[PDB]
Amino acid sequence: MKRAVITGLGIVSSIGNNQQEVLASLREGRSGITFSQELKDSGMRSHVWGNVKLDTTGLIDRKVVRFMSDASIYAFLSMEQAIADAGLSPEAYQNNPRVGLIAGSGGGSPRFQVFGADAMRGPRGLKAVGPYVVTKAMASGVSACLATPFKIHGVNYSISSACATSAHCIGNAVEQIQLGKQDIVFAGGGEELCWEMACEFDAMGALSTKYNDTPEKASRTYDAHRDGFVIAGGGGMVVVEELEHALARGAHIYAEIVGYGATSDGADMVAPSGEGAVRCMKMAMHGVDTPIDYLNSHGTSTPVGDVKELAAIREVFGDKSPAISATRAMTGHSLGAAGVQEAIYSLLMLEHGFIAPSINIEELDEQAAGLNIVTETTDRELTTVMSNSFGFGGTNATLVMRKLK
């Protein structure tokens, strides 16, 4: 069947508003975490986040942005970057049945769903709500808000699977190319950052709460003193393209998606089973004749979760384990956008021949014993890289990307 490659990328994250700023941040191990007055004022215990530092005012036409929540805004900007980076013009991708879009968010828009209810409960009711809340809230906001202004005619929907969201979007995009249904599928996602949603995670005891005085050190994946994840917002989009179609137009090909694993734990609602991850990673490596050189781990900086993945990694590789780093230590956990942002961080490592450092590890965790956790920006000629995304509900996604031959 058909092979799929990535021919363009775009990103708006806590560590950079485009691939150049993100590349700079990754090489220097710069943290995108800051103190959040909004979270403190809301009454939360976690006072830090991986916020997008960008004034998006006037970046999107009013008639388009009026329908959008922040998740869509971020994904929209990311898609604009990916389209340019791919060297694509309207004539090639708009009004074309063979071009699609699969992009989602993990939470939709808790901020606008709450704005809707607050406004409706006020004296103006429906008038205060306005006619734009359905497209801002609504789990498919990200796909709907982008497909329309970009004149997408092919496939159009959102997949959501919590933290694995945008990784499943990419994988489904790959399947569309393999099934011969689409020549190009823009795949990614976005996630707003707001106390409305962050508090649900804090109420769950899932967010870091001991490092509010030193934001940049709160996300500390693999560190013995990790106490939860730092929530983040952002967006990402990659252009997934059928190989012959890409070669035929002289596209710049970052890599081929040679493996995609999607499995389920069928065990715990919030913690990973590990058994699911093992199968997912193996499914993704199946048939890949080259070793994994780098693995961007799921590790969100939580006690059990970090340990569960490492064990799964040991089970899959043994002593032949790849270089490992958790960019989450610098970026925070962007939920729905995490899969595509991490697939991007990984393509930038594959593209620029380096491994970003897993920062804030002051004392490695006993579980990471027989594994190579890279903690300093390291130059290396990577060929095959893997990225794991494991979300609540026991849902797993692993993407394997390789330089083309």
Contact positions with its own copies (CB under 8 A) in 79-108: 94-95, 97, 100-101, 104-108
Query: What element of type H or E holds 23?
Result: helix 19-28
> Residue 47, interface with ligand [N+] (CB under 6 A)?
no
Q: Is 55 exposed, middle or buried (0-12, 13-18, 19+ CB in 10 A)?
A: exposed
Q: Spell out, one character per residue from 167 to 206, where the chain touches its own copies: x when CB under 8 A holds, - when not.
A: -x---x--x--xx---------------xxx-xxxxxxxx
Contact positions with its own copies (CB under 8 A) in 111-140: 113-114, 116-117, 120-121, 125-127, 129-135, 137-140
Contact positions with ligand [N+] (CB under 6 A) in 371-390: 387-389
Q: Which does 227 bind (CB under 5 to 8 A by kind): its own copies, ligand [N+], none?
A: none
Q: Which two tokens stand for residue 324?
A: 């490992």
> Residue 212, interface with its own copies (CB under 8 A)?
no
For its own copies, the closer of residues 239 and 371 by Cβ is 239
Query: What element of type H or E holds 260?
Result: strand 255-264
Applying CB under 6 A, which part among 154-162, 180-188, 290-298, 376-384 lies near ligand [N+]?
Answer: 290-298
Q: How many residues bind ligand [N+] (CB under 6 A)?
A: 7
> Residue 10, interface with its own copies (CB under 8 A)?
no
For residues 101 and 185, the answer to whether their CB atoms sit within 8 Å is: yes
Q: CA 93, CA 186: separation in Å to the nearest integer? A: 10
SS3 of residue 401 by DSSP: strand
Examine the residue annotation and report whether 168 is marked as an active-site residue of this protein: no
For residues 173 and 4, the answer to whether their CB atoms sit within 8 Å is: yes
Q: CA 337, CA 248: separation in Å to the nearest integer? A: 31
> Residue 249, interface with its own copies (CB under 8 A)?
no
- Please report the beta strands in 280-322, taking only residues with DSSP state E, as ranges in sequence order: 294-296
Shortest approach of its own copies to residue 13 CB, angstroms? Answer: 20
Examine the residue annotation and report whether 333 is marked as an active-site residue of this protein: yes
For ligand [N+], the closer of residues 47 and 298 by Cβ is 298
> Residue 308, interface with ligand [N+] (CB under 6 A)?
no
Examine the residue annotation and report whether 298 is marked as an active-site residue of this protein: yes
DSSP calls for 35-96: E-HHHHHHT-S--EEE------TTSS-HHHHTT--HHHHHHHHHHHHHHHHHT--HHHHTT-
Pairing of strands 372-373, 395-402: unpaired
Shortest approach of ligand [N+] to residue 393 CB, angstroms? Answer: 17
> Residue 342, interface with ligand [N+] (CB under 6 A)?
yes
Active site residues: 163, 298, 333
Binding site for ligand [N+] (CB under 6 A): 296-298, 342, 387-389
